[PDB]
Amino acid sequence: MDPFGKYKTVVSARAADKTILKKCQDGGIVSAAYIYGLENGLLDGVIVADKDDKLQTTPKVATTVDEVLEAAGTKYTVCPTISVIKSAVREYGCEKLGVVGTPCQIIATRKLMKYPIGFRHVPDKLALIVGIFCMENFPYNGMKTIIEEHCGIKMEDVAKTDIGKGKFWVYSKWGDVKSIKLKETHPYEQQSCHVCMDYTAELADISTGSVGSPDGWSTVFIRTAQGEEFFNKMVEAGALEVKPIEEVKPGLGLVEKLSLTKKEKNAKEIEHRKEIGLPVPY
Amino acid sequence: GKIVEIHPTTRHEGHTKLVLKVDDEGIVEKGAYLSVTPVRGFEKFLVGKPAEFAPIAVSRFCGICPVAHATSAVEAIEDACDITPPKDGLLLRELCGIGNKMHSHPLHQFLISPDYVPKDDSNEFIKRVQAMRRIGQYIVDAVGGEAIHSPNIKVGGMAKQITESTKAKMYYKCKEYEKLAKEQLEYLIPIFESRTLNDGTELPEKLGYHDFGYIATHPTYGDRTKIDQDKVVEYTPFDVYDKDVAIQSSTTVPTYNGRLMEVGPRARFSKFFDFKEKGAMALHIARAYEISVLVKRAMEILDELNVNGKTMSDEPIVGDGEKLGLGVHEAARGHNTHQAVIDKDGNIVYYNAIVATTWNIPVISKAVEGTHYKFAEHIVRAYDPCISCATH
Amino acid sequence: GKIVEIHPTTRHEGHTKLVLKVDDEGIVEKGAYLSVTPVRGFEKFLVGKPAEFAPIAVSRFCGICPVAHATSAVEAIEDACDITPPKDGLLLRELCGIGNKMHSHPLHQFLISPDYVPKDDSNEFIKRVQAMRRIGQYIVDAVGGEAIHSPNIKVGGMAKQITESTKAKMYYKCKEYEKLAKEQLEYLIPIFESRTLNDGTELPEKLGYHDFGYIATHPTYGDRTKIDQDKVVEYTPFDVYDKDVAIQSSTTVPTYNGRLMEVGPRARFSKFFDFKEKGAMALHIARAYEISVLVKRAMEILDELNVNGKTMSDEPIVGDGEKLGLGVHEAARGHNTHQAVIDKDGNIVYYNAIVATTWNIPVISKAVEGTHYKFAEHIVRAYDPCISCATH
Amino acid sequence: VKIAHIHLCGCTGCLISLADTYEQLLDILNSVELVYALTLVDEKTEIRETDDKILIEREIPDDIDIALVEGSVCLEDEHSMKDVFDARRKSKIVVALGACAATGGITRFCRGGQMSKPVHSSFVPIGDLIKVDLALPGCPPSPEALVNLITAALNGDTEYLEIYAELAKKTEACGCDLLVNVINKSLCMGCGSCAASCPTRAIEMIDGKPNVLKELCIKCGACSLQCPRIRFPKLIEEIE
Ligand SMILES: Cc1cc2nc3c(=O)[nH]c(=O)nc-3n(C[C@H](O)[C@H](O)[C@H](O)COP(=O)(O)OP(=O)(O)OC[C@H]3O[C@@H](n4cnc5c(N)ncnc54)[C@H](O)[C@@H]3O)c2cc1C
């Protein structure tokens, strides 16, 4: 079956602005695309996922670069970014809106556009749909057990979390680092993710993630014309460092591996549900 | 050494599991009693709902003692909104919670009867149980509006008042209940004191011993000033179980002043009647002794009650959106706590519940240690565990 | 009909003596436990000195528990001058006291280990208590300014505040201490409950029984409203010893409501966790159980604490020259009382101290009666006596 | 003649309502033998002993004639789902006892966020997974209506049980069934019997038409069951 869906080109890239790299999760692609639209009149508002002192998430409509930098970094917990999409074009008055979301959130945006029943004036103002890769997500209390009880670090002392090398990582405000085997986190994951058939956010203008690229770099799929124009304006302005994915290691094969592993697994779950009488999307 | 696992344990309310590290002789070295019931998550879907919906929803925690959660819920909301229910509404509310316990305790004595009541006495014993329970359920129906899940327990007091005639035949039903309770007492007390089951098995003297304290705010109702919630702290299962069993528990680990604490009839008899006997048999004995104080208290409430007195407060359900209201109630199984924050519009901002059996689960885990594993379930049932309650 | 005198008794703090009238079989008929340490007389050279000097000087009562006396000293001076320390200064002061008890209890378990810890387990055992003491002394050094004799315990609160970094470093040190404490507790409790020494000697079941009550005002800190000082009366040694032994005692005999009273971990556990077990072994058990309470309470203080909050009161140190201030604190070894009268100039007109072990000394005298004299020192050590404290 | 009480994600309130047939309980336990009920009997015990474990399990027996199933099914708990399929496998007649098993009931409001099982958030009536033969609404159904179900099940009174067998095909109840089926379809005459059936006093008669207080309805289905303009079988018309 198709591994990555349709796309135009795949590269490995990172932001040129060094400040962004200091705060971002991987290559800083989402923050670098948001800061460029905002500063060069391609975006007047971007949807982000912010956190408080305890890592609790809040979807928000940002309009300044500093708002973008604060929202940089991954929160491995559920954050409804699309719940503010109408707010963004209503009271906030945006007309060139940037959207970010996990694959399922990007699917909800395409559904939103094709059948905009309760979305008057919303589809025409979506200027950049950025998707981030995703394998699983977690309820907040699910991640809280993982961090505080399995990694032994309080939420208020977490500076950054990262998933990689069959291990989940917690970096502390005070220099400490702790990692646990990724199989100790499974029972805490949102079970509705077990029917998700999208790993690389195949329906986005631009998709980005860490798998396939080294630390500090992001593997980015360019998919639609809208995302192509944006990206090309960025590299021409020197906003990004780009290397062809064919040279950097591990490379695209690791993406294909994981993308098919997710699809083959959750495919069985969909058929299992159909078997015992439970509804699935169609 | 060896591992024993008893799953599910029987003749109590709900779904639990025992996990016991035993030696080659059967004696328990490490004990682990825990809930595996799926968590419905009541407190979390009450957020946003109006305050009036709390006593309705939390009643469905458990159908054996629904009154206890409706009471704690309205006490918690009233505390947050600074509402005072009237004298006769409160009398009626306590009478309702007593009527529930008047049916719960005989019910539990029916649940444990296969171990202690001989077969030849089994029939007359159950008929006496159902006779006592009938009265108790009558009281809950008359005051609360329904026997199972009472809608009259409302923020502000009690929705309705009884008639002079209802109060009369309730008094004389309580006299009958008092006569059956003395009958039941004179029968079970000697069996518990004998320490032997109906099949001849003598139980160890120190069966069910533990080194934890008690929590009890009142002998028959509840008194939030007899506790400091700031000192109540809920820890995770990883604090009391090993890692592979802790990730199976569905409940939290409540502590007071840093230690686990027992709740229930023995906890109340220790704080009001100087009852200090340890073990699983003493728990059963306290529960039997308490049936008398429940019916005597009900008859005193009926003499004090004015059936024409106001039962609902006019004060409005409004809060500051900050104050963490506290509502406690001695359920049949013990101290039962609900907490509520209410905003200016009368809606729930934050909700939480620390149920009675939740306190007792980690205590039972330690009490089964010291004795043979084929006695573990006898200790468990001594605590009258209600898991749908402890999990909610 | 014979006298046995053990002088000095060992593996505890200070210099004492046992005088036992025994029968022809070894059983103690009349027991006497009394300090013979020279009296330094702190309370008497404090009169005339400024109030700020009191917590510096009384801290030198004892180097094991110096935080206990600085705390009671300031608390007593504050009471006499109507000073109210700020929220976060009070939290830091209690935290400083818990850190001191976090080192004292493990230290005592080290002092008694030659009797109860086997030889092959001794090295591992000492490494555990030294690691636990390291964390405790870290907390006292961080909050109090010095590990031994903490100059930050001042009239008005605490002199210095900690940083957000050291608060985080303390919390995670407390988690490690909680891990070692559970290790230590699982090890020692089976031994204390076995009632036998490491050489195979089984101790009597009623070893260390007495018929006296307890005093305790708080599980981890202190509360002057839980005691009526007017009911505390210091008598002379002639009231509890025979004349020829009484003239040797260096300490006064404190009583509450006319009787001798025990203080310490068992006293607190009796007043807050319903722990009512008599005897010497039960004392060791209570102290071990208390280690968990201490570190759990410390972690709760760290979550509540505001590192930026005020820690010293601006109120002046002035008194009327008549009011008898009262300061109480639950030292490691029990309820500890200081009294002071401050004049308008801030100077001390009257000072007095009734230290914890002072309460326990006449109780120990009676607890050693009934058993063979070769067991008396085991009863003495169960009380963790600190004589330099008791005499001051 | 073999009955079983299965308890899934419920509260035991329905079982207590069964116990509140005090006098008829001793008459029912002689005519039928109870073979499984964790709260009442120690069945069915099987011990498995290896060299390192001793497992004492209580499993659902075989050859159950009637199974009173109480409570909904939690889709994130393997045991909860194993027991609903196991009860169906081993029972000739399964009865959705109470609104939790029949239509979801109060558990419809579950959405998780509550430890210690942060993933538990999906609760469905048993009918969504297994075929169910009879359904009894209410929170809880009365002891009277229970005795009637058991009497009719043992006597083969299919005519009486038809209204519950029909309910077994629908797994969705609400207070709004009265509006969508009786008020909007020009059938409500304003008797008020629905308001008198409600356990949460959520129905209030205004202008001769039931007004549902939506934030007080727990979706027990007692009012739609009672409405004689929805279902009025001819057997009701025979009196004495
Ligand atoms: C639950 C989850 C699982 C993931 N799993 C994988 C994986 O298996 N493999 C992989 O390669 N990549 C995964 N990612 C994405 C990856 O970790 C990085 O977020 C991605 O590369 C973007 O980082 P960046 O440095 O390029 O942009 P950044 O400059 O770091 O900006 C990150 C952006 O992500 C948004 N965001 C953060 N958390 C959330 C959330 N919970 N929901 C919606 N938006 C959010 C923020 O608004 C922010 O704008 C996952 C992300 C999430 C949230």
Ligand code: NFU
């Ligand atoms: N009694 C009782 Fe409950 Ni069913 C318990 N445990 C609660 O409040």
Ligand code: NFU
């Ligand atoms: N603990 C202690 Fe002291 Ni060294 C004694 N006894 C003082 O307050």
Ligand code: SF4
């Ligand atoms: S796994 Fe699928 S459904 Fe779950 S958060 Fe990721 S994209 Fe969404």
Ligand code: SF4
């Ligand atoms: S339907 Fe009502 S009474 Fe029956 S189990 Fe569910 S909540 Fe309890």
Ligand code: SF4
């Ligand atoms: S029972 Fe039916 S017909 Fe009668 S008032 Fe209610 S909805 Fe109308």
Ligand code: SF4
């Ligand atoms: S309105 Fe009342 S009877 Fe009807 S479904 Fe709601 S709670 Fe049940």
